[PDB]
Every structure is written in C-alpha cells, then in structure tokens.
C-alpha cells in the first residue's frame, strides 16, 4: 500500500537517475 | 533497456496508486 | 485530495516515461 | 529537459508518498 | 455556485474513471 | 455502462466551463 | 491562459471517452 | 492506456479548477 | 459533437500558439 | 514577429465560438 | 514542427467550420 | 448566424500561420 | 477550400507517418 | 489500422493535386 | 491512375464500415 | 446515408474493376 | 450489372444534390 | 428550394432502386 | 413491377432539375 | 459545372431504367 | 424521348471534351 | 480512346438532332 | 485554344437543348 | 489477373452492404 | 424555334474535332 | 453484426486489392 | 508551376507507402 | 526504415504546398 | 531523504525559472 | 507571485544547501 | 562539493532579490 | 540578461547537486 507506493517510487527514481548518468 | 524497466517500474507503482484509491474513501 | 496529486504527478511521468520512448 | 522534468514528477510523487505515510 | 460544481463533476467523472481502470 | 456516465457526467463538466468562459 | 487550458484538457477527456465508447 | 490517458488529463482539468477557485 | 469537437482543436491549436510565442 | 498577431487570432476565432456557444442550447 | 502540428489543428478546425455551415445552412 | 465570422476568423489565422511558414521560413 | 484542404490532409498523413515512426525507436 | 489511414490521406491529397493540376493544366 | 482510383475509393469504403461499427458498437 | 457512402464507394470500385478487366 | 449501375448513377446524382444543398 | 423537393425525389428513386437490388 | 415507378421518379427529378435550370440559369 | 453532371447521371440512370423495362418485357 | 437523349449524347460529349480538355 | 467515344457521342446526338429535325419539321 | 473553341460551342448547343427541354 | 478475385469480392461486399440496407433500412 | 441550328453547333464541333483528330 | 461480416468482406478485397498494387 | 513538382513528390511518397505496406 | 524516407518526402511535398501557399 | 529535498527543490526552482522566463 | 515562489524556492533549496552541509 | 553547491545557490539568490528590487 | 545569467548558474548547480547524488546512488 502506502510503503509499497514508496518501494517503488524510489526503485523508479533511482533507475532515472542512473539511466541519465548515462544519458 | 533500463528506461523500459523504469517505466514498468512506474506501472507497477501506478497500478499500486490506484488500488490506493480504490480502498480510501 | 493529496494522494489524488501522488496520482496525477505519477501519471504524468508515466506518460514522459512513455514520451522518452518515442523519441527514442 | 524532458528527463529532468521526470525527475521532478518522480520526487514530487515521492515527497507526496512521504506527506500522505507520514500522517499516517 | 458554478465552480465548485465544476470540482464536484470531475471528481464523480474521476470516481467513475477511477473504478474503471481498476477493473477493466 | 459505467463509462457511458462518465462520458453524461463528463459532457456536464464540459458544459460547466462553457458557461464560466461565456459567463466572463 | 490557465482557464480556457483548463477547458482545453477537460475537452480532451472528452474525446477519449468518445474513442472509448467506439472501440468498446 | 487511452484510460490512463483520460485519468491523466482529468486530473490535471480538476487541478487547474481547484487553482482557479484557490483564489476566485 | 461536431462543434465541440471545432473548438477542441481551435483550442490545441491555440496552446501550441502559446507554446510557440513562449519559448521563440 | 508574426506569432502574436497569429495568436491574437487563434483568439479571437475562440471567442467566436464561444459567443455561438452562447446562443444555441 | 509543433509549428506544422498547429497548421493542422487549424486546418481541421476550420474544416470544421465548413461542415458546421454544410449543415446549418 | 456568426458561425459566418466564425469561419473568416479561422481562415485569416491561417493566412497567418502561412505567412509564418514565409517569414519564419 | 480546395488547395489548402489538399494541405490538410497532406499534414494529416505527415502526422500519422510521425506517428507510427514514433513507436519504432 | 493506421498504415491504411495514411494510405488514403496520401491518394487523397494526391487526388487533389490531380484535380487543381487538371483545371490549372 | 485507375487502380489507384480504385484503391482510394476502396480504403474510403473500408472507413465507412468501419466508422459504421463505431456508431455501432 | 453513411452506408449509402459506403454503398457508393463500392459501386465505383467495383467499377473500376469492370474498367481494369474490360481493358486486360 | 447495369443494375447495379443504374443504382451508381442514382447515388452519383444524390451526391451532387446533396452537395448542391450543402452550399445552400 | 426546389433542390428540396429534387434531392427528396432522388432518394425516393434510390429506395426503389435498392428495393429491385435486394429483390434481385 | 415497381420499376414503372422507377421510371416515373426519374422524370419528376428531371422535371424539377429542368424548372430549376430555369429558375437559375 | 456540377448540375450538368447531375442532370447527366439521372438521365443515364433514366435510360438503364428504360433498358431494363424493355428487355425482361 | 428523343429530345432528352439528344441532351444526354450532347451531355456525355460535353464532359469527354472538358476530360481531354483536363490533361490537355 | 477518350478521343473518338467524344465524337461517338456527339456525333449521335447530331443524329437524333437530324431525326427530331425531321419528325418536328 | 484549339480543344477551347470546340468545348466553346459544344457548350452554346448545350443551352440551345436545355431551352428546346426547358420549353415542354 | 487477380483482378477477377478482387471483382468478385467488391460484387460479395456490396450484396452484403445490400442485405445489411435490407435489414437495417 | 430554332429546332435545327444545334445541327451548326454540333457541326462545328465537329469541324474542330477532326482538325484536331487529322492534324495529330 | 451482419455489418462487421461487410466489413471484413471490405478487407479481403482491400487485400486482394494492394495485392493487385504489387506488379507494378 | 510547382503544382506539378507537388504532385510528383505525393506521387513518390505514394510507392514508398505502397512498398512498405508491402513490407508490412 | 523507409518510414524515415517517407516522412522526408511528405514534408518535401508539405514545402512545396507552402511555397504555392507563398506566392499565391 | 535530505539530498532528494535538495534536489527535488532545485528542480523545481529550476522550471519555476524557466515558466519565469517565458514571460 | 512567479517571483515570490521562485525566491521562496531558492532559499529552500538553500536551506538544504546548508543543512547538508552542516551534516556532511 | 556540498560547499560549493550552497555557493552557487547563494549566487543565484543574490540575481533573484537583483531582479526583484528593480521597481 | 539577469534571467539568462539565472539560469544558467541554476543550471550548473542542479547539474553538480545530479552529481553528489549519482555519486551516493
């Protein structure tokens, strides 16, 4: 739920930041 | 590659927002 | 009303998401 | 540009989780 | 008298939107 | 079903800020 | 700007109701 | 996807009411 | 249907005007 | 240059629709 | 180009217009 | 009815996108 | 209403070649 | 679904010019 | 030029049923 | 009426077919 | 054949009255 | 306004037609 | 059968396209 | 132009009516 | 008759002239 | 073949001119 | 000029017929 | 050559268009 | 009235045709 | 239903169609 | 003047989408 | 692939539109 | 959490100065 | 209030400039 | 690094109350 | 000028504050 949404969120959020360390 | 895991990443979390919703009222 | 904007920020970005793949 | 601003819905979305768990 | 209907509109168009995506 | 509402309920909202905009 | 955009993306809505109803 | 498109910009209509009204 | 459907791509058209006057 | 006299337009035609908006329904 | 994507949201509009008079004219 | 000054609205933003599409080009 | 609806389409063929360009890379 | 779509606008357009080519010939 | 006619008149058909089961279902 | 489009596109087509033989 | 070619004039003609009529 | 009464004999002559198509 | 009156809506078309090649031409 | 095709087309259509009259007949 | 198939052969020669005159 | 069904056409209806001629003189 | 002229009086025979119609 | 094939479908498509104005209209 | 004169104007369409027809 | 059958009637002989568009 | 150039360049872009659709 | 191509053609044939757009 | 505010405030502040130069 | 939420935003981020550094 | 970053921030402050104290 | 400046020093510190945290993950 609400821990899950935050799981998530900060998977996300770390594969955007390497995926533009490369772009 | 990464960008495609990230937006299914993203999916997952969205789903996971709406059954958020679908439960608080 | 705020989980509501937790929402729509993430659709959103979803939705860039899916615009970087097009372009790309 | 179109990334950054990701990031921005990204985070935004994220301090939003953080708002919406912490009250609760 | 008019605005807050408008609110109240889309947030029953988004209630109806809402359970749609959940299900289909 | 479900999605025919929402587009009567949609159609109002729409209606709702035609009146503003004419409105003023 | 930010009241006829309003009425602009709500207007959208409208039209993928619309494709929605066609295709299903 | 269409759905969630629809969600997306009904969200940001609803938005850009809210921040009308916020002062109006 | 048919005019809404007139002022929804007026309106579009209009943003990217705004858009166009913005950013050139 | 041009952009805001064209936009100026896109305007004005919206106003046009709008006041027709007004006048039937 | 978002240039040429307005041209068109124009042309449809005003092709529009030319139905909106086809039939209540 | 005005769906007349309707149309002459949508055509002269045209003629101004073109004459963008000129000048801008 | 003639040439520039020759436009129209025109465009509107441009839009949808972009389109499916846009899901191939 | 939308290569077809494309297909008619491009003939359709192509129709057009034939037509303005052959009044203007 | 003739099959192309055909071939234009045909996927000008084609979207009428087609636009005829989105009225229709 | 949009059948009897329909109806009419058919005609020429097949038309043209009866031209496209006649000839090879 | 001539039928169905019969019907082709009629459908012809109905497309030019309806035309006629529309910039009418 | 005697395409009115023109396009309406068209179709009439139309219906007939069809009428023969169907009963051939 | 009915083909008689096929023939008879024909003319009464043709009768009215005549008085109107008057009524205009 | 455009009426002279009409009138040409139902008096074609007049005269396949003729035709098919006579011939089962 | 005989008039109106003089005004259909007149007809059809008139529009197989304008058809070379065209791309011609 | 445009060429000759021209004067295929016209030169009939010159025939049916000579008969309606003849039987109205 | 040369297919011109020859459309030219095809086109006067036309309206000559058209009277000798328009007449009865 | 399959020219034919192609004939004889429009001929099948416009029965069923025929039969569908039968049930419908 | 003037029954016949359609003969010169067919007859100088003609005249013109086989100009044409002969020259080429 | 009966509609849909015309329909995809419609797409063999558009197949059958640019299937003919190949040879040349 | 360059009707003909534009109506060359429709012309090509219709073998290129001819061969494509081809392709698929 | 060729889609690419495609495009650049379109747009060729789109200058050319514009450029008749332009002097006339 | 800490260096997020910081960049989340700095990307914000970011398109807040480009919806500024827009004017 | 562009200017006023902007500079709210820079001593923000400032603060956390800070902040952070007072820590690390 | 840190350091410099709340530099820049300073900087970029002084141009904002720079373009606010102009009327 | 003063925007311009603006945002090219806020540029370069979201660029080096991107920095700190890639490096931190």
Chains 1, 31 share one sequence.
Do not use: P, Q, S
């Not at 739920?1 to 772009?23: D, G, P, Q, T």
Request: aromatic share 4%; net charge positive.
């Amino acid at each position: 739920k609400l821990l899950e949404l935050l799981r998530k969120l900060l998977e996300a959020l770390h594969k955007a930041i390497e995926l533009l360390e490369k772009w």
